[PDB]
Amino acid sequence: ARQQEIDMKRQQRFFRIPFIRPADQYKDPQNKKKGWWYAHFDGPWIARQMELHPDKPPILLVAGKDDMEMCEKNLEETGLTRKRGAEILPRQFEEIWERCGGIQYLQSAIESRQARPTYATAMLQNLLK
Numbered sequence: 001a002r003q004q005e006i007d008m009k010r011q012q013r014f015f016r017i018p019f020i021r022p023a024d025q026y027k028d029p030q031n032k033k034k035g036w037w038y039a040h041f042d043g044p045w046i047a048r049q050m051e052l053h054p055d056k057p058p059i060l061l062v063a064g065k066d067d068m069e070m071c072e073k074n075l076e077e078t079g080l081t082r083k084r085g086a087e088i089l090p091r092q093f094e095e096i097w098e099r100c101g102g103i104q105y106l107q108s109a110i111e112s113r114q115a116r117p118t119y120a121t122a123m124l125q126n127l128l129k
Contacts, residue, residue: 006122011043013075014093015086021053040093040120044074047118050096058100064116065109094127103127 016038024032033054040048049070051059061070071078080086097103106124109115 002117003122005117006119008119008122010119012040012090012119013042013081014038014040014048014088014090015078015080015083016088016092017080017083017086038088038093038096039071039078039080040090041071041075041078042119046071047116048093048097048102048120050093050100050102052096058096058102060097060100060102060105062102062106062109062115062120063118065105065114067116098127 016036018034018036020032020034035051035053035056038050038052039046042048045063047063049061049063049066051061053059059069063070073079075081103124106115106121107128110117110121110124115121
């Protein structure tokens with residue numbers, strides 16, 4: 001069943017990491033746009049992904065659809081966890097998620113059965129009201 005897929009009984013971890021682009025990093029100390037990478041991992045994998053770059057629009061990625069775009073490494077295989085407190089709050093993630101159009105993207109794959117009902121999709125269904 002739908003809920004059977006989502007199943008809100010797994011691990012939920014959200015993180016973020018503000019890293020500067022190498023190219024801009026050295027070519028110009030001032031002209032070094034900072035890119036923020038956030039990802040809401042679920043258990044050993046992830047279900048929500050969002051990228052923000054001063055030069056690159058809000059790249060909203062999700063499991064199933066942008067499985068190749070989003071993080072392709074388990075929590076330990078990611079690195080954000082190893083960092084110095086990469087974790088974050090769900091309020092911030094959903095803050096930007098709505099600030100751009102993540103829900104719309106999810107609702108699109110959700111209906112097309114591409115979003116892969118894992119957790120965000122269900123959370124989205126509730127976030128719709």
